[PDB]
Amino acid sequence: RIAAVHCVPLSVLIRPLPSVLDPAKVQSLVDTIREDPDSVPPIDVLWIKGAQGGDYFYSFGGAHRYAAYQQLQRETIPAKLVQSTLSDLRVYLGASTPDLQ
Amino acid sequence: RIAAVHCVPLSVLIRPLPSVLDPAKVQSLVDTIREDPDSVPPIDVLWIKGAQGGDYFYSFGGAHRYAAYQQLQRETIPAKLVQSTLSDLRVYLGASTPDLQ
Amino acid sequence: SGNAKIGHPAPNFKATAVMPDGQFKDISLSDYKGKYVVFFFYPLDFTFVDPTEIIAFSDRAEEFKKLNSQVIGASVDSHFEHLEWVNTPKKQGGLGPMNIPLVSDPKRTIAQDYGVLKADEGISFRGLFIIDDKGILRQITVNDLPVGRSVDETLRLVQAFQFTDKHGEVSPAGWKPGSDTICP
Amino acid sequence: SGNAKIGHPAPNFKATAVMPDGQFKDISLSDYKGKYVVFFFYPLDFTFVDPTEIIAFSDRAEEFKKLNSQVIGASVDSHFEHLEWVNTPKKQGGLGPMNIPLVSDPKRTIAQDYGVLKADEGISFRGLFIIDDKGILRQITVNDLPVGRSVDETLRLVQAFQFTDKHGEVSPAGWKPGSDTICPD
């Protein structure tokens, strides 16, 4: 993990795998984020470089935290950035791994 | 395929694949069998010989007709006998094929 | 055996098929690039068991069409035999009219390529293969002879692959981490 | 690929597994003869995706037990790593307590035997195998990495195979066709 906590714009987060959301857990996290945001840990974000040095940010966990931040219409979400490679991505995506540029 | 139509005891037929029965279709066959049995064609029964000459009779079709004869408390059911080998059986049953004796 | 490997190009074939209109056509797997393909094998035409699973995939062909996917069935029987079966009533253990093409594999080479040949009997196991719109093999399913495949399961898999495929249509973030992006 | 062939004895393995009680045990597939076995691979411990699929098979282990069937998971990770993952909270992407054994395949030899190795990555695909009570392979399922397996589909398969197996317990008919068994007019 990169050192500090980064505020990643929700709009740049790629979430390629489906998840089942419990609306009550989403609402519960919405409430907590408003009241005591420090109690909601950062999600983990994989930062991958494309072949031409493009930046890509993948989110594979923290579904309910992400849903809650989108509900609050936040610009960014606290995240730990994990510098990763295309090879790492392919573990998740297999033959859906894009030819990232 | 053996020439005539044979009346096979319901109790000797081996029916190793599941079928889904429509109760209204079973009942409709029951009534026809009562009124006009000649209009209900024989089921097809595979006659297989075991390794030591045992006789085995397999039923793979005619699920509704079979259920209707059962419902009617009949001893036998009209059938066409088709003399078949263990190799033929294995097409249906794969590694469920018994070591028939 | 065979050459069907997940994440690699699915083995191509050219074969005579019986088409939904009842006509013969020689087709290749590669003809369907741009579409998902569900390619399935079954052992033999005209056995004493009803072809319930083939009828199910045919009956539900619209649910596959809605997912831009083509269903294709195959066995080692001739295309002439496939057509006879199509033209045989279901009450006589027949197929009836089909919404899907049925490939003929009389040389057993397609079954061999897909590793589903029961070599002793010269018939195919119940193999089913999901191939993406790029021609890449995504899913292998092979059942022993007595147990059928689920249309519901197959549609589940197609939609799940397509979900993640669609999420690969991305361009770079245009956002760069640095000292300025640490959360306050 | 590999040596997993339908209708043939499933490739045996001996491997160190983390048992449901958290102990290590060297187990073989052949230990489970007399029972159906659902043997499944997954790529890696401790990735950034929650092991939803594994938790589902363990959570519903009772439904497999009702079918006299044993579920076993495997990956290339060490058994030490399996236990760390068991002992990781789900809110940290852990597995939590398991009702199933988790096999360690660090030489990739089991995955290769079952033909599910993704060679370019050194990890297994999402292969799942149904092996009957005689040790015979009955079903092959292999998914590319992004898509999980269904417990409902697996239970359907196990029950369908067992239905047909059970109807193979037959005895000779004691009825013989002849001129006497032709249906009367």
Ligand SMILES: Nc1ncnc2c1ncn2[C@@H]1O[C@H](COP(=O)(O)OP(=O)(O)OP(=O)(O)O)[C@@H](O)[C@H]1O
């Ligand atoms: N009100 C709350 N409801 C749920 N979790 C909370 C709440 N407040 C703080 N948290 C913390 O936020 C984290 C939420 O993690 P959790 O694994 O439950 O969901 P998620 O990762 O956001 O979504 P998913 O696990 O479905 O991908 C945990 O560390 C939890 O302690």
Ligand SMILES: Nc1ncnc2c1ncn2[C@@H]1O[C@H](COP(=O)(O)OP(=O)(O)OP(=O)(O)O)[C@@H](O)[C@H]1O
């Ligand atoms: N009342 C009736 N209902 C249905 N079929 C009837 C009836 N009377 C005669 N028949 C004939 O009996 C045969 C029944 O065949 P059908 O394939 O519909 O059922 P089955 O073979 O007994 O069971 P399944 O096909 O479900 O295994 C057909 O030839 C049909 O024409």
Ligand SMILES: [Mg+2]
């Ligand atoms: Mg019928």
Ligand SMILES: [Mg+2]
């Ligand atoms: Mg979580």
